[PDB]
């Protein structure tokens, strides 16, 4: 699905994404995609937003994550879709 270089992309989160990131990690201006991806992963895991009997599906209809991504649920295996959902919440910097 994804090239390995993608995680090196330098990004500046939009306000809503930054709000979420600050609840799981230190506040800075610029992140790598690897960092954004990790913090979002930890947010999901700590808040237990996944189905216990169906661990590939994240449910976020009752969470700010749902507002960020614009979906009630998604699969952790759908990597291309996740990248698209994240990208709409940031500006790439070069
Ligand atoms: C309960 O057991 C359990 N174990 C494991 C998982 C679990 N599976 C994956 C991820 N997780 C966690 C950290 C949420 C993780 C992931 C999912 C959603 C988001 Cl926004 C962000 C991340 C970082 N990701 C993934 C997604 C992309 Cl685009 C690229 C690379 C990876 C590795 C996965 O494939 C998981 O997901 C809820 N549950
Ligand atoms: Cl929330």
Swiss-Prot record:
Residues 1-84 are annotated as: Sufficient to promote the mitochondrial pathway of apoptosis. Induction: By DNA damage. Phosphorylated at multiple sites near the RING domain by ATM upon DNA damage; this promotes its ubiquitination and degradation, preventing p53/TP53 degradation. It is found in: Nucleus, Nucleoplasm; Cytoplasm; Nucleus, Nucleolus; Nucleus. Residues 9-92 form the SWIB/MDM2 domain. Signal peptide: none annotated. Residues 1-93 are annotated as: Necessary for interaction with USP2. Ubiquitous. Isoform Mdm2-A, isoform Mdm2-B, isoform Mdm2-C, isoform Mdm2-D, isoform Mdm2-E, isoform Mdm2-F and isoform Mdm2-G are observed in a range of cancers but absent in normal tissues. Interacts with p53/TP53, TP73/p73, RBL5 and RP11. Binds specifically to RNA. Can interact with RB1, E1A-associated protein EP300 and the E2F1 transcription factor. Forms a ternary complex with p53/TP53 and WWOX. Interacts with CDKN2AIP, RFWD3, USP7, PYHIN1, and RBBP6. Interacts with ARRB1 and ARRB2. Interacts with PSMA3. Found in a trimeric complex with MDM2, MDM4 and USP2. Interacts with USP2 (via N-terminus and C-terminus). Interacts with MDM4. Part of a complex with MDM2, DAXX, RASSF1 and USP7. Part of a complex with DAXX, MDM2 and USP7. Interacts directly with DAXX and USP7. Region I is sufficient for binding p53 and inhibiting its G1 arrest and apoptosis functions. It also binds p73 and E2F1. Region II contains most of a central acidic region required for interaction with ribosomal protein L5 and a putative C4-type zinc finger. The RING finger domain which coordinates two molecules of zinc interacts specifically with RNA whether or not zinc is present and mediates the heterooligomerization with MDM4. It is also essential for its ubiquitin ligase E3 activity toward p53 and itself. It is linked to Seems to be amplified in certain tumors (including soft tissue sarcomas, osteosarcomas and gliomas). A higher frequency of splice variants lacking p53 binding domain sequences was found in late-stage and high-grade ovarian and bladder carcinomas. Four of the splice variants show loss of p53 binding. MDM2 RING finger mutations that failed to ubiquitinate p53 in vitro did not target p53 for degradation when expressed in cells. E3 ubiquitin-protein ligase that mediates ubiquitination of p53/TP53, leading to its degradation by the proteasome. Inhibits p53/TP53- and p73/TP73-mediated cell cycle arrest and apoptosis by binding its transcriptional activation domain. Also acts as a ubiquitin ligase E3 toward itself and ARRB1. Permits the nuclear export of p53/TP53. Promotes proteasome-dependent ubiquitin-independent degradation of retinoblastoma RB1 protein. Inhibits DAXX-mediated apoptosis by inducing its ubiquitination and degradation. Component of the TRIM28/KAP1-MDM2-p53/TP53 complex involved in stabilizing p53/TP53. Belongs to the MDM2/MDM4 family. This is E3 ubiquitin-protein ligase Mdm2. The chain holds residues 18 to 111 of 491 of the full protein.
């Amino acid at each position: 699905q994804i090239p390995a270089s993608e995680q090196e992309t330098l990004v500046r989160p939009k306000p809503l994404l930054l709000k979420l990131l600050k609840s799981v990690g230190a506040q800075k201006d610029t992140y790598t995609m690897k960092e954004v991806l990790f913090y979002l992963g930890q947010y999901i895991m700590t808040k237990r937003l996944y189905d216990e009997k169906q661990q590939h599906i994240v449910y976020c209809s009752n969470d700010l994550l749902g507002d960020l991504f614009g979906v009630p649920s998604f699969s952790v295996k759908e990597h291309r879709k996740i990248y698209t959902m994240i990208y709409r919440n940031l500006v790439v910097v070069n």
